[PDB]
């Protein structure tokens, strides 16, 4: 169908501008920011200024009540842009003023409109403050009762992965490729009418377990490309504690060429029910694309972290 | 006469699309799917969308009540396509949303219309979930009180047969030739007016014992082609436990050229009377086809597994 | 936006004389002096004479009540010039007549007009008098209850830094670059739309803690330019006791080219939360300027010295 | 501004005729004498005769009451010539008839007109008598209750300084240069608008401590030119007992070229506050003149000798 990504705040808009000018199929991007200076120079072709009568183009400050109230009084503006959609993604970095407050408001618009919403957040760095981590912890409660799926990319685990003195654009961009793989992973799943076919309906029942989520795409090629793709797709090194045990909903998609083997299918599916052996449901897909070469792809969604 | 195969669900349509573009004699195929994306690219010349007002062309999800209710409200649509027929086969992969629910509904249409129906199901893989096997076990009860003859091709026994790293298409396509052999075995029995002519009269009284069924066709050629055909046709490697002891209905068809020996018939009949020695009826047949070579064919139907 | 520096007294006018004829972007300068003899020859093209009916172009003497009452009666002139501004800096040298009295009055105009004001004072030399330091100590109370942020450049610590027999102009001119760095550092922070973006909103919430402040910009270039910039920006050698422990508000801006690294980022920020680990808020910024070379800049503002 | 020096008596006329025909900037001189014989031949272009109806142009004799009465009855003429001025200096040699009487009357005119007045006196020689020294002390007591600042050049200390058999004219011209240096130091204090700037206000509030005063200018050039100039400025060899301890008001002006060093200022101020460490106010100035050479000038005013 058609899908949308609403990235609120300046950091959420930073995820959007990378996605613009790529080859995009059936996806439109909306930028939300209380502060209008960040929306001045962006590659995204549409911009939304929220709280223009309450800030006149400025941010939310260190008090997120300014960012919460600015989005609250422009709830008329959020509903109009969210039309004709059935999957929205909330891109933000929690811990600040706007993204801590405005992102639940877009979720509140999303939940009021009967749409399936998934929020992607980044918990801040530890050195930037521990007192400000407290309301960032309470900001999770602000998002735990309004969003079906909590995607978290904590910044305290940013240095432990590729700690070779990478660029600040690169480690920020690594979290962006998590969300881009999340957006493109759902998009390639539903749009493609494979030999076996998963669409929106069994997508919807997976992350309705109301818990923490994790969704990324592992790509492998080789003789044992099935185990390398299954283990890469389940590995999310950019989280504090993934806590795969006690999950309540699993969604697996398999993509391979016409040389796809039952040994390849089982060994991807062999590692998925080891932690999902509890009283929980697992949805499995399969796709057979003839034009693309021997590269294999596995997309895994795991929601319901209890 | 004229026969029909109604394959519900996306996987059931995959069984149907295998049978298209072959040489077809007096057989029509109808494709049933709640999800309309799988019906977009199929070789079958006619498509039926069920639940179009309840899903807008989407699936049934992990809850099979959506698949059951979508088929229930289009019972007006199921009766119209099932007309002028006297043998329908229900092709589905059980354990999901639609095939768990919609296949009993097509059976309920079939039973209400006074037609002889046999349902072919595939119990899911063990790694895909054991909790979802529980309602798949209750899904057997959903089909045990609406279908005369239960055909099961469990996916847990897919590995033990030709486990040489076969393709996912090949392991799935093996079960489709089981149903194609089931359809073509009945059709070649009925359409041919051989030297001995089995027809509708003895066919109906065999599988009306209201139990599990098994329908395969063994082909052998050689000096002892009788025992190789009889033992292949009685062996169904794609089932959990065939349980041939305690059967209540046996239907046997023998096909050979004019060089047929009376010892060829007896030894095929000898291995069938061994396990059918209980208080049960056995129907046998004979065919004398002059044009075809020394290749011999044996079709055995065993319904009433108790 | 547009910002203003209000420099009262003759010495405060000397601070204004330094910044006139430089390349100025969005900043206007207003000169205040009760004594009109120092305003006779100034490089600034605009002047304000306060107390012309009470002194006729003369100073305030050793009694600052003359300097206080001269500004108090001409409060009509101070409000008219302070229009369309959102950030004013009070440049004065305390301990005299006018700057001891008139600078709180401009603050009183600033506080009445709903503007964010920071007052910058220089405590006098120790040899010029200790009795006159007593009301200069009491002049701190005169400014502690009217200005959000107290910037102090004491003259008793002037000799301990670059005590190589520097010029009187150079020892005085060092304190003017404290102001020029303070004014330009806030100016370059907001006027630039960086890749990450700070503006007035989180600026405003930092120094509203009603305490002593410190504002300097450390510039480093090299292999370990992160630690050299962070330690230079946190070091203010021109104060009595900086007292970083017990701060209530921190504002940090980071400027680098597109080769910016994580190992640059935390190592700047690691020295900031060592003393700001108490129950206080910390704001971090970041800018990515492509045109400029490998030189790196760090601007730190720390208000709320308790 | 514009300043005046009122010189009563023959010694005052000698001081005035010494200052006339020099290069004069903004200064006017008025010559007062009860005896017109000294006013017969003077280089000053304007003359005032007081007591012309009481003496017919003769002196006051050995009784100062005659000069006091003459000045009292020509107070009407005294008031008219003192107009438009803000600084007057009383030049007289005490111990005689006219100056001992007329100078307190000019002081009374100055105090009645709201002007800043400082009196310069010369206590007479010891060999001329001690009975007249008694009423010289009485005249000092008379002038102590009418003049803000008492400048004394006693003649008993005239021989102790440069005692190489100098002429009487040479010692008289030395005292005249003391008074001229006082007047001219005040002149280029108020007239010059230096980089730092002293004006009339702190001047007015310094010598209002109502005590003995001292006003001299020390000039030095060299490597340690600060200490030599400051010690020459503080040394007044032409007084009985300078009594720097217990002062109540200090006024210092510093003049140097653009090569002025901080250490010069430190050493000058350091040798000022040693005797000015009591509960007293110190006013410190600075000037930066670019055209003149490496010569340095220090002007020190110390009023309030207690
Ligand atoms: N990992 C990243 N986190 C970010 C980035 N940008 C912001 N953030 C996080 O977002 C938080 C601050 O965002 P704000 O709530 O202030 C949204 P704001 O309106 O201030 O954006 P702008 O004013 O447009 O810069 C803070 O905790 C940061 O850790 C980024 O590029 N990467
Ligand atoms: N052996 C096979 N089993 C299958 C195949 N396709 C599906 N299935 C089984 O069917 C079950 C899921 O089918 P569904 O009830 O969801 C019918 P659905 O409307 O979802 O089909 P589509 O949405 O058109 O793909 C699941 O338990 C699978 O094990 C197949 O090609 N081979
Ligand atoms: N560090 C510096 N302190 C100064 C400077 N100029 C003045 N001051 C300080 O300011 C105080 C005196 O300022 P005033 O109250 O007299 C203001 P005023 O009207 O007299 O200035 P002008 O009359 O124009 O010179 C005194 O304590 C000095 O220590 C300067 O150039 N540098
Ligand atoms: N140091 C100096 N003291 C003087 C000078 N002339 C006078 N005097 C002192 O002034 C005192 C006498 O001055 P008078 O009061 O008589 C003023 P008078 O009108 O009589 O001056 P003439 O009429 O010009 O003689 C006496 O004590 C002298 O010591 C002088 O040139 N230098
Ligand atoms: K799909
Ligand atoms: K037949
Ligand atoms: K900015
Ligand atoms: K001056």
Numbering used by the authors:
A (entry chain C), B (entry chain D), C (entry chain B), D (entry chain A): 11 to 316
Task: Reproduce passages from the article.
We determined the solution structure of a single straight protofilament of KpFtsZ by cryoEM, in which KpFtsZ was in the T conformation with GMPCPP bound. We prepared cryoEM specimen grids for the thin filaments with 0.5 mg ml–1 KpFtsZ supplemented with 1 mM GMPCPP. After refining the helical parameters, the reconstituted 3D map represented a single protofilament of KpFtsZ with a helical rise of 44.02 Å and a helical twist of 0.025°. Although the resolution of the final reconstructed 3D map reached 3.03 Å, the quality of the map was not enough to trace the main chain in some regions and to visualize many side chains, and the resolution estimated from the atomic model (dmodel) was limited to 3.5 Å. However, the map enabled us to identify the β-sheet in the C-terminal domain (CTD) and the H7 helix and to confirm that KpFtsZ adopted the T conformation. GMPCPP was present in the nucleotide-binding pocket where a clear density of γ-phosphate was observed, but the density was not clear enough to determine the accurate position and conformation of the GMPCPP. The density corresponding to the T7 loop, which contributes to GTP hydrolysis, was also not resolved well but bound a metal ion. The main chain carbonyls of Leu199, Arg202, Val208 and the side chain of Asn207 were coordinated to the metal ion, as is often seen in the T conformation crystal structures. KpFtsZ in the cryoEM structure of the single protofilament was, however, clearly distinct from the other three and adopted the T conformation (r.m.s.d. = 1.887 Å over 280 Cα atoms for the P21 dataset, 1.935 Å over 279 Cα atoms for the P212121 dataset, and 1.858 Å over 276 Cα atoms for the double-helical tube dataset). The KpFtsZ monomer in the single protofilament showed the typical feature of the T conformation: the central H7 helix shifted downwards, and the CTD rotated outwards to open the inhibitor-binding pocket. The T conformation protofilament in the single protofilament structure was stabilized by larger interface areas (1114 Å2) and lower free energy (ΔG = –17.8 kcal mol–1).
FtsZ is a tubulin homolog GTPase protein that is widely conserved in bacteria and plays a key role in a complex called divisome, which carries out cell division. FtsZ polymerizes into protofilaments to form the Z-ring that acts as a scaffold for accessory proteins during cell division. FtsZ treadmilling, a motion in which the protofilament polymerizes in one end (plus-end) and depolymerizes in the other end (minus-end), drives cell wall synthesis that constricts the Z-ring to form a septum of the cell. In order to aid high-resolution structure determination of the FtsZ protofilament, we developed a monobody (Mb) that binds to both KpFtsZ and EcFtsZ with high affinity.
